[PDB]
């Protein structure tokens, strides 16, 4: 049945973040009056962390383990669903559709998705989500 549920990892097919990996926060299979197509609010990685080896120092590893994030709404036709799924508890009250009318709130949603991703990255789980797709 349906598979565009929250938590799924998607590949962005078009735009600035073409080729970047994101996660579906909210899904709207029907058409909202604002946009009559099926769409989803996603949070993704703009700048992936750099690879870290045992030879690097702690300060270098910390500086290379930094993530830049993006929050967007996408047409389903511009997403490629992936079998992989990532369960990060993104705060729904900060990552919303309303985040786009206000620049200040957009910074809040970007910072929250940033902070959560860094925590998940350091723990070593979801290794695929934090690698950059080579295309």
């Amino acid at each position: 049945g349906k598979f565009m549920k929250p938590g799924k990892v998607v590949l962005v097919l078009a735009g600035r973040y073409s080729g970047r990996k994101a996660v579906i926060v909210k899904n709207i299979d029907d058409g909202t009056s604002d946009r009559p197509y099926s769409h989803a609010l996603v949070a993704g990685i703009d700048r992936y962390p750099r690879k870290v080896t045992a030879a690097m120092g702690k300060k270098k590893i910390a500086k290379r383990s930094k993530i830049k994030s993006f929050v967007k709404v996408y047409n389903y036709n511009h997403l490629m669903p992936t079998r992989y799924s990532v369960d990060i508890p993104l705060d729904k009250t900060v990552v919303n559709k309303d985040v786009f009318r206000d620049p200040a709130l957009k910074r809040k949603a970007r910072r929250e998705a940033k902070v959560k991703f860094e925590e998940r990255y350091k723990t070593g789980k979801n290794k695929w989500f934090f690698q950059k797709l080579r295309f």
């Binding site: 590949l11 097919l13 600035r16 073409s18 490629m80 295309f135």
Partner: protein, 114 residues
């Protein structure tokens, strides 16, 4: 009717002697020598016949006095590949890597069970 003369010593209708007609504030018609028509970049894919979008069609040596935003599109492979083939390589890269994991798991499971 006023007739025209070349303003330069090249008397031949070559590709670098092309001119157009301009009316001066002195109410005279003179020749103005025109630049060659530039072409926008062709996609690196090799299959798309059309030119790239969002890039100025200028002669190559003038390209170095433009800003970077006039020479690219904000996207991976921006001013060198089209959007359609960039989309296809994202999906082609992902789907082939998915098949490789499946093949490796299938051969590992088959080896373990045999």
């Amino acid at each position: 009717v006023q007739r025209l003369t070349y303003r330069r010593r090249l008397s031949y209708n070559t590709a670098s002697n092309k001119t157009r007609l301009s009316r001066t504030p002195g109410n005279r018609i003179v020749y103005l020598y025109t630049k060659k028509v530039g072409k926008a970049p062709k996609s690196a894919c090799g299959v798309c016949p059309g030119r790239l979008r969002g890039v100025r069609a200028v002669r190559p040596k003038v390209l170095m006095r433009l800003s970077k935003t006039q020479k690219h599109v904000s996207r991976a492979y921006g001013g060198s590949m089209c959007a359609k083939c960039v989309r296809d390589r994202i999906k082609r890269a992902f789907l082939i890597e998915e098949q490789k994991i499946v093949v490796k798991v299938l051969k590992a499971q088959a080896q373990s069970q045999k």
